[PDB]
């Protein structure tokens, strides 16, 4: 038959012609199972490769190359063919400690197409070091040469498949995926490898689930139906829209059927090499509404003169229905190209080149020396040639970097069923040359598969769970921003007393608002205080121009002159209120204004007392009146009140501090008013409390004798001025209790100026009136009346 | 010593053997292991003792000799494949044929006692299955070796990982921990255990928060992932070295204590058990095997070593060249190893299967053709073999069944000991009363996830397999828009939402309604004030020619009473729904009449002050002009300036009816608000100056005892106005925003009542009750 061709050096093969998709005493042969077409395709590829070696006189001249292909089941039959290959021509395999002198029947073996059988065959062959170039086996366990010394490969491992998947996800900006594996070892290792790889590229896995192993052509149980319903419900409820599947193609019919039944659409499925080229699933022709079906598969290399050769055409070494099965799938195989066929082609060519180099042939003659399998392995480890514009050389880890290819399923039989969209180069670990992909969206937009929306400019990122890439966006509170260069996970406030608005990434400096010389209310208050100051200066000039008069002598001469000078000083330091509040400014203000005002009010009160209530008190305590008249009662009272005010103002300075303060007004954080007392309400309340305690007794004493002429109607004018001061203080207290803002300083200054104006006018202006316009009442002879 | 010479023994049926006797390419040469291992020699001697005991017995294998070929296989499979090929070779020949199927073979060994290593057992079983050679392997544990599809002739004497993992899952479910983290070693043992436990947890409802692989001697990321989830029960299905590295790193980083469910690999290993500082790593709960022990094995080992020391027997009579040059002290540490019983029972199982296959009684065994190895398999399943008084059975999948003990570590003087606190014979039965946990008190460490979310909550999937949900409550003002939402959505900022609500409720208005108790009381006060104004007006218009009203104004007094009544009337328009016109016209309507009455009172005060504290020369001209048409022009000017100020502040300062949607908790607001202290202050300034002038000109005066004090009433009216409004302002700035209009009307009504009871009421008292003081010489 075609499974055997005698030659100088045989070349064993292992191709899965049949698979199981529906008692140990009866051994089920591979013939009873359903016929697979890929196995016969690869077998014909190997036959064509050997036949081309035979044609080529430049490669292996005068050395006929043969082969012995044995049908190997998927799992069931994997030991007998190895024993056949290693047995001698008599089917006897000797046992010895060392096998260097041993000459096997075959010189090399093309390994099985599934990883488990490859592992078993390589485990058996490790004793004799028979070169075994497996194809289409993608397990990472074959990458190490400690336990597989004589195992080579012509297909990139699952490492490069996973890398291509991750690069495809990165290119389209997907960071929230779903992994579905199978109960078999292949799915589990692929899922674990993808999970290990994807964690370092800022891509998270929403959830991983295992699809129960379920061959087709058999009815499903209730437990597996419930399991599939649960899987599909979990898939639909999650927000991820990129589903990678690591499962053999046989177990995916029921899952996709359940997905169609559940009416779930909008998933960008990513396929491993197992079912990315499976023709039956594409022929199902109802998945076109699910979404785009990407997949990872080996790049197709067009072999010249292979389609015509393929179309031209012991135990477990026969098949009958292979040709009939391949007849139906001929067109799709021709259109889709050859992907795994080139792997077998290259493996056979590598064996041929290793034999040619080992024999040392000079393209004319060959030495025809006996070749041991270990010598062939040592030679094939160091082959480096070309084949269809592809370099064939083996890495130290037993792999040749064949270009991968991301393929997208296209539901149109007029062209290739699996249209290539991208190419991956394992040598540089780079995925490049990406073409347009027909997406399933409304207007061909790349589907979005991100768990968390991008945060708005100036929004703190708060982790929501275990997954790093998922977060929630919460606005930073007023007064802070985000320094994206430093960290975006926590707001960083702006120092230097500057405030920020909501969702604002640039702190702005607060403007320092304060009393300034060129404004309207300050100019009005300055004009009022100037009018008062010139009025009081004129009063003082008049008083010094008119002395030795009953008006100024019955009244306290030194007392009134001192009060006038203190009012002059207070008016002259009034503009110290305006301007930049410094330590000296507040020191002078609080050591001058309250002192002067308090001593003026104390003088007024003691004068009212001595003019009204002294006469009445003269009746009860006579010796007290003698003490009062012998000394200078009003002067000692004024001194005592002055020292008490000194004590209280010193305690106020020691309590509330001296440094000018910055208070953030509720109207506009952007502004910051500066007063000099950090605690101003309590200080003003204390000052007004002492002043009003003195004022109530002063005004009561003035009222008690308001009709007595005394010192030219002193009680009446004291009463008028003191009631004016009381009303002004009440107005200030109420306005303070019902307002707090920028106008506090100007209102306080206005009230102080008005109080000084009251004390000046309503107590001295009558005196100026009588002195100037009434020159008859100031004569000494009028003292009698 | 020549101990290795005893590794063979001729007999009618000879058993194979693959033991780890020794320990650790270009040419195809089998590697040679020269290092010596005590465990392998102990197991080989156990098998030899079992074979000798079977030969000794007369009721088992009667008149038949059972042999053994104990071959040394290292942990590597390359060195182990050669003994297997020797086993499958024809007896007396060194060549193994490559036949079509198993039936044509004539193997030299009846059965094989499989390798201890399960990774080696994989290759050995897959090789033997083609020839259907019955191999029973001690120590091979992981589950996929039980698959009859690829291992039709692989049995074992130790339980699979499936039963112990089922026991662990049942323990976690029974103790309530359905939110656990699963870890495993990077070798095949850990991966298979992780897959099996994943299946069992999915079946039992348990949730795996993080499934990860601790690398063999990275770990930091695994610990970080475990700590990220709030998990207090961690199943570590790892080998000894991986567990030791894990616990050493956890000691270095001071990881918080957790309940470590231990696999049998490191549950009883002294390396992990004796780690310094390990006591602070929570409780360790494992499932140790419950198997009998050979009570005479050490005696046999000592006696056989001594008998081998004698040269007479040794001369009277390689696989382990290093096994000859040993002493007793080189093996004394491993006599009490529980795999010796497994080897013993495996040999007994093969012997009993052979006895059943030959079908013979205790007296003898009939002669027949030699039995092929593949004929044992028909009787090795369904096989009941008694080993040391305890019966064992081979399941349909070659699995033996035995009980388990839940052992937990305790700590006293850094001495960890194992106590049985449970038993697993297919159904877990724990005694948790005696269990001492690691927490502050003796309480079970809780580790539970919410399988379902309570109604009205948002659900966030959590776990490596989306097993449970995290219920999160969000603060008021938010609602769950749809059940599948991952975050509750806000509603329209004009509607309120209660805490933990499926939907929001609309915000309805709440202003000062006509039915509120405060408005009712203020309405009664307004009624009383208006009645007083009407009575005073009636008295002032009936006794209009009397000296009382003539001195106290005249037409002007009645005009002021009308104005006070109109102020009381304008009080009415504050409450109710804030129409823009009403809220705009609140204040001007309040001050327009009050301005008129205050100006009339000020005219009276000015007349009194002019007649009192001025020279007669100016008085004779001021008094005759301040009463009459000039007084009317003065009151008209006051009203006109009030009108001008009111219209200017109405066109410039906007009184707005704003709807503060975010003031009341469950309701909106309709606040009629104007400029802060600017609008009403400016409208109030004219009245303030008018009242202050009246008070200043009236409050001090000479009241002769023979006349009438016409200043007391005006002084007290101004005082009532001032004190009531000075008290009103803080109430304006302090009372709740709803009752602000009520405060305003209360202030206006109190001002009117004070003015009345101070000025008009004392006049009316003597105008109505005691008309004996109405003489012109007393008033004018
Ligand atoms: C060359 O190979 C072809 C098929 O590739 C085969 O049919 C033919 O016999 C070979 N020899 C020659 C001389 O063409
Ligand atoms: C089971 O298999 C039979 C035979 O192929 C098939 O007819 C049937 O639909 C399947 N399902 C059930 C539920 O019987
Ligand atoms: C869509 O979904 C519904 C609801 O699950 C399902 O019954 C139906 O078969 C699906 N397909 C169509 C075409 O309606
Ligand atoms: C191709 O797809 C069709 C349409 O569903 C299907 O019937 C057929 O079995 C598939 N396979 C072929 C023609 O080989
Ligand atoms: C292929 O099928 C046809 C009928 O369609 C049959 O005549 C022929 O023998 C088959 N060929 C095989 C089984 O090789
Ligand atoms: C194989 O040969 C090519 C062509 O000279 C060279 O570029 C390449 O580096 C070689 N590869 C190795 C592995 O030596
Ligand atoms: C796709 O095309 C239509 C027609 O030009 C355009 O109006 C529409 O916005 C596009 N779709 C999307 C989702 O942007
Ligand atoms: C923000 O980060 C930059 C870059 O490190 C640094 O220079 C700067 O001081 C930080 N703060 C602000 C307020 O920009
Ligand atoms: C077998 O029996 C003999 C006596 O017949 C005894 O000496 C020997 O120890 C026994 N073997 C054992 C117990 O392994
Ligand atoms: C084994 O193969 C031979 C080949 O001659 C066959 O006759 C025999 O029936 C086979 N035995 C089985 C399948 O059990
Ligand atoms: C335990 O961990 C520490 C910290 O990493 C390390 O230094 C030490 O060598 C480790 N111990 C062992 C026995 O490996
Ligand atoms: C573990 O997580 C807790 C809780 O977030 C944290 O405080 C602690 O630093 C983490 N690390 C360790 C080693 O405990
Ligand atoms: C016996 O033990 C000694 C002491 O540990 C050791 O040196 C010697 O190698 C051992 N003999 C062996 C392993 O054969
Ligand atoms: C049991 O079998 C033996 C061997 O054939 C035979 O000699 C004997 O008679 C049988 N019966 C009894 C009761 O031992
Ligand atoms: C043997 O196994 C079969 C399986 O069908 C069972 O019916 C029978 O009871 C078993 N015999 C035993 C356990 O002795
Ligand atoms: C397991 O043991 C319990 C008692 O601990 C017993 O009730 C139960 O029947 C046993 N189960 C089996 C399968 O033997």
Strand content of chain A: 5-15%
CATH class of the largest domain in chain B: Mainly Alpha
Largest sheet of chain B: 8 strands, mixed
The major β-sheet of chain A equals: 8 strands, mixed
Number of helices of chain A: 22
Number of individual domains of chain A: 4
Shape of chain B: rod-shaped
CATH class of the largest domain in chain A: Mainly Alpha
Cytoplasmic side (chain A): 544-558, 613-637, 705-716, 762-785
Subcellular location (chain A): Cell membrane
Main location (chain A): membrane
Function (chain A): Putative taste receptor. TAS1R2/TAS1R3 recognizes diverse natural and synthetic sweeteners.
Task: Write structural notes for this entry.
- The complex is a heterodimer of chains A (785) and B (780).
- Chain A is α/β, with parallel strands linked by helices and 785 residues long.
- Chain A folds into 4 domains: 4-155 and 314-337 and 340-393, 3-Layer(aba) Sandwich (Rossmann fold); 158-302 and 410-432, Response regulator (Rossmann fold, 3-Layer(aba) Sandwich), CATH 3.40.50.2300; 454-506, no CATH class; 520-783, Rhodopsin 7-helix transmembrane proteins (Rhopdopsin 7-helix transmembrane proteins, Up-down Bundle), CATH 1.20.1070.10.
- In chain A, 43% of the residues lie in helices and 14% in strands.
- In chain A, strands 11-10-12-13-14-17-18-19 form an 8-stranded mixed β-sheet, with helices on both faces. A 4-stranded mixed β-sheet of chain A has the order 1-5-2-7, with helices on both faces.
- The radius of gyration of chain A is 54 Å and the shape is rod-shaped.
- Chain B is an alpha/beta fold and 780 residues long.
- Chain B has 3 domains: 3-158 and 339-393, Response regulator (Rossmann fold, 3-Layer(aba) Sandwich), CATH 3.40.50; 161-289 and 404-430, Rossmann fold (3-Layer(aba) Sandwich); 517-779, Rhopdopsin 7-helix transmembrane proteins, CATH 1.20.1070.10.
- Chain B is 44% helix and 14% strand.
- In chain B, strand 19 (404-412) and strand 20 (415-424) form a beta hairpin.
- In chain B, helix 20 packs antiparallel against helix 21 (712-734).
- The radius of gyration of chain B is 55 Å and the shape is rod-shaped.
- Chain B starts with 7 loop residues before the first strand and ends with a helix.
- At the A-B interface, helix 2, strand 6, helix 3, helix 5 and strand 11 of A face helix 2, strand 8, helix 3, helix 5 and strand 13 of B.
- The structure holds 2-acetamido-2-deoxy-beta-D-glucopyranose (NAG) (16 copies).
- One 2-acetamido-2-deoxy-beta-D-glucopyranose binds at residues 384, 391, 393 of chain A.
- One 2-acetamido-2-deoxy-beta-D-glucopyranose binds next to loops of chain B.
- Chain B: Residues 542-553, 611-632, 701-712 are cytoplasmic.
């Amino acid at each position: 038959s075609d499974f055997y061709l005698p030659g100088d050096y045989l070349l064993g093969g292992l191709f899965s012609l049949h698979a199981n998709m529906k008692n140990f005493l009866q051994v089920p042969m591979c013939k009873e199972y359903e016929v697979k077409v890929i196995g016969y395709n690869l077998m014909q590829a190997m036959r064509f490769a050997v036949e081309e070696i035979n044609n080529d006189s430049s490669l292996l001249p005068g050395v006929l190359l043969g082969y012995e292909i044995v049908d190997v089941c998927y799992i069931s039959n994997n030991v007998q063919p190895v024993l056949y290959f290693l047995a001698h021509e008599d089917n006897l395999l000797p046992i010895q400690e060392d096998y260097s002198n041993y000459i096997s029947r075959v010189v090399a073996v093309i390994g099985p197409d599934n990883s488990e059988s490859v592992m078993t065959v390589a485990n058996f062959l490790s004793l004799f070091l028979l070169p075994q170039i497996t194809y289409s086996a993608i397990s990472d366990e074959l990458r190490d040469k400690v336990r597989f010394p004589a195992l080579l490969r012509t297909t990139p491992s699952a490492d490069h498949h996973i890398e291509a998947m991750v690069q495809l996800m990165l290119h389209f900006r997907w960071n929230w995926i779903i992994v579905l594996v199978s109960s078999d070892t292949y799915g589990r290792d692929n899922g674990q490898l993808l999970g290990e790889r994807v964690a370092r590229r800022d891509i998270c896995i929403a959830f991983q689930e295992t699809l129960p192993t379920l061959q087709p052509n058999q009815n499903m149980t209730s437990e597996e139906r419930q399991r599939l319903v649960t899987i599909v419900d979990k898939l639909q409820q999650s927000t991820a829209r990129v589903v990678v599947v690591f499962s053999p193609d046989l177990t995916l019919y029921h899952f996709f059927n359940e997905v169609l039944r559940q009416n779930f659409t909008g998933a960008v499925w990513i396929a491993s090499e197992s079912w990315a080229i499976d023709p039956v699933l594409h022929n199902l022709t109802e998945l076109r509404h699910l979404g785009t079906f990407l997949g990872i598969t080996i790049q197709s290399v067009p072999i010249p003169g292979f389609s015509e050769f393929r179309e031209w055409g012991t135990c477990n070494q026969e098949c009958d229905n292979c040709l009939n099965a391949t007849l139906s799938f001929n067109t799709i195989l021709r259109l889709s190209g050859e992907r795994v066929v080139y792997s077998v082609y290259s493996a056979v060519y590598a064996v041929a080149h290793a034999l040619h180099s080992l024999l040392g042939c000079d393209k004319s003659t060959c030495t025809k020396r006996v070749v041991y399998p270990w010598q062939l392995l040592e030679e094939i480890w160091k082959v480096n040639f070309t084949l269809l514009d592809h370099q064939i050389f083996f890495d130290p880890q037993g792999d040749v970097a064949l270009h991968l290819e991301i393929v997208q399923w296209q539901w149109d039989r007029s062209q290739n069923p699996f249209q290539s969209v991208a190419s991956y180069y394992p040598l540089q670990r780079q995925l490049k040359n990406i073409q347009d992909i027909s997406w399933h969206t409304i207007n061909n937009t790349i589907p979005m598969s991100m768990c968390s929306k991008r945060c708005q400019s100036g929004q703190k990122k708060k982790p929501v769970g275990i997954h790093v890439c998922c977060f929630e966006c919460i606005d930073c509170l007023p007064g802070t921003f985000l320094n994206h260069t430093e960290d975006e996970y926590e707001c960083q406030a702006c120092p230097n007393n500057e405030w920020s608005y909501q969702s604002e990434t640039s702190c702005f400096k607060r403007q320092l608002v304060f009393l300034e010389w060129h404004e309207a209310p300050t100019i009005a208050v300055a004009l009022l205080a100037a009018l008062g100051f010139l009025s009081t200066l004129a009063i003082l000039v008049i008083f010094w121009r008119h002395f030795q008069t009953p008006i100024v002598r019955s009244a306290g001469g030194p007392m009134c002159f001192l009060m006038l000078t203190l009012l002059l000083v207070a008016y002259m330091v009034v503009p110290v209120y305006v301007g930049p509040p410094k330590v000296s400014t507040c020191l002078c203000r609080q050591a001058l204004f309250p002192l002067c005002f308090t001593i003026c009010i104390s003088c007024i009160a003691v004068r009212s007392f001595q003019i009204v209530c002294a006469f009445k008190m003269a009746s009860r305590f006579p010796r007290a009146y003698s003490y009062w008249v012998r000394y200078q009662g009003p002067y000692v009272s004024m001194a005592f009140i002055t020292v008490l005010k000194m004590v209280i103002v010193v305690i106020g300075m020691l309590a509330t501090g001296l440094s000018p303060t910055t208070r953030t007004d509720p109207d506009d954080p952007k502004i910051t008013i500066v007063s000099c007392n950090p605690n101003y309400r309590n200080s003003l309340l204390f000052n007004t409390s002492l002043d009003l305690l003195l004022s109530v007794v002063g005004f009561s004493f003035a009222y008690m004798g308001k009709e007595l002429p005394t010192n030219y109607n002193e009680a009446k004018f004291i009463t008028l001025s003191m009631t004016f001061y009381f009303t002004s203080s009440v107005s200030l207290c109420t306005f303070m209790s019902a307002y707090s803002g920028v106008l506090v300083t100007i209102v306080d200054l206005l009230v102080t100026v008005l109080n000084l104006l009251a004390i000046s006018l309503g107590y001295f202006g009558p005196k100026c009136y009588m002195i100037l316009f009434y020159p008859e009442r100031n004569t000494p002879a009028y003292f009698n009346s | 010593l020549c101990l290795s010479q005893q590794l063979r023994m001729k007999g009618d049926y000879v058993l194979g053997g693959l033991f780890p006797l020794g320990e650790a390419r270009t040419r195809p040469s089998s590697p040679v292991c020269t290092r010596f291992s005590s465990n392998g020699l102990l197991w080989a001697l156990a098998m030899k003792m079992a074979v000798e005991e079977i030969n000794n017995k007369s009721d088992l294998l009667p008149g038949l000799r059972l042999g053994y070929d104990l071959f040394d296989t290292c942990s590597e499979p390359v060195v182990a494949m050669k003994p297997s090929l020797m086993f499958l070779a024809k007896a007396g020949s060194r060549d193994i044929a490559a036949y079509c199927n198993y039936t044509q073979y004539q193997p030299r060994v009846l059965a094989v006692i499989g390798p201890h290593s399960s990774e080696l057992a994989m290759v050995t079983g897959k090789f033997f299955s083609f020839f259907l050679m019955p191999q029973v392997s001690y120590g091979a544990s992981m589950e996929l070796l039980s698959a009859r599809e690829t291992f039709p002739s692989f049995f074992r004497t130790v339980p699979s990982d499936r039963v112990q993992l089922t026991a662990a899952a049942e323990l976690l479910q029974e103790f309530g921990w359905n939110w656990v983290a699963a870890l495993g070693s990077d070798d095949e043992y850990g991966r298979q255990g992780l897959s099996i436990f994943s299946a069992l947890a999915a079946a039992r409802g348990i949730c795996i928060a993080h499934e990860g692989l601790v690398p063999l001697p990275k770990v930091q990321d695994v610990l970080h992932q475990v700590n990220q989830s709030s998990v207090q029960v961690v199943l570590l299905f790892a080998s000894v070295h991986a567990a030791h590295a894990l616990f050493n790193y956890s000691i270095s980083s001071r990881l918080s204590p957790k309940v470590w469910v231990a696999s049998e690999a490191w549950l009883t290993s002294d390396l992990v058990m004796g780690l310094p500082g390990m006591a602070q790593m929570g409780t360790v709960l494992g499932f140790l095997q419950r198997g009998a022990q050979l009570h005479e094995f050490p005696q046999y080992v000592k006696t056989h070593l001594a008998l081998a020391t004698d040269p007479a027997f040794c001369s009277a009579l390689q696989r382990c060249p290093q096994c000859d040059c040993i002493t007793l002290q080189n093996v004394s540490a491993g006599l009490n190893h529980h795999q010796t019983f497994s080897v013993y029972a495996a040999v007994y199982s093969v012997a009993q299967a052979l006895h059943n296959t030959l079908q013979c009684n205790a007296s003898g065994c009939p002669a027949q053709d030699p039995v092929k190895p593949w004929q044992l398999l028909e009787n090795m399943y369904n096989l009941t073999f008694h080993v040391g008084g305890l019966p064992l059975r081979f399941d349909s999948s070659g699995n033996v069944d035995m009980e388990y003990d839940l052992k937990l570590w305790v700590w006293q003087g850094s001495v960890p000991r194992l106590h049985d606190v449970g038993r697993f014979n297919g159904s877990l039965r724990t005694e948790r009363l005696k269990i001492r946990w690691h927490t502050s008190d003796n309480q079970k460490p809780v580790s539970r996830c919410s399988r379902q979310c309570q109604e009205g909550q948002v659900r966030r999937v959590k776990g490596f397999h989306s097993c449970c949900y995290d219920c999160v409550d969000c603060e008021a003002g938010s609602y769950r828009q749809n059940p599948d939402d991952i975050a509750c959505t806000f509603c329209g900022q004009d509607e309120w939402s209660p805490e933990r609500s499926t939907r929001c409720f609309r915000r309805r208005s709440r202003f000062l309604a006509w039915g509120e108790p405060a408005v009712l009381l203020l309405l009664l006060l307004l009624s009383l004030a208006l009645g007083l104004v009407l009575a005073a007006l009636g008295l002032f218009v009936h006794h209009r020619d009397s000296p009382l009203v003539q001195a106290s104004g005249g037409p002007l007094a009645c005009f002021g009473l009308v104005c006070l009544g109109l102020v009381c009337l304008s009080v009415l328009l504050f409450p109710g729904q804030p129409s823009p016109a009403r809220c705009l016209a609140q204040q001007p309507l309040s001050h327009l009449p009050l301005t008129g009455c205050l100006s009339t009172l000020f005219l009276q005060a000015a007349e009194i002050f002019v007649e009192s504290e001025l020279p007669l020369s100016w008085a004779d001209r001021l008094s005759g002009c301040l009463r009459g048409p000039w007084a009317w022009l003065v009151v008209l000017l006051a009203m006109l300036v009030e009108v001008a100020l009111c219209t200017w502040y109405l066109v410039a300062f906007p009184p707005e009816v704003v709807t503060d949607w975010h003031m009341l908790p469950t309701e909106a607001l309709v606040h009629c608000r104007t400029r802060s202290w600017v609008s009403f202050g400016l409208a109030h300034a004219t009245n303030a100056t008018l009242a202050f002038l009246c008070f200043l000109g009236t409050f001090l005066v000479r009241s002769q005892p023979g006349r009438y004090n016409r200043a007391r009433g005006l002084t007290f009216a101004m005082l009532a106005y001032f004190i009531t409004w000075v008290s009103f302002v803080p109430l304006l700035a302090n009372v709740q925003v709803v009752l602000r209009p009520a405060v305003q009307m209360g202030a206006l009504l109190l001002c009117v009542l004070g003015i009345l009871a101070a000025f008009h009421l004392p006049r009316c008292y003597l105008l109505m009750r005691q008309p004996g003081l109405n003489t012109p010489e007393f008033f004018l």
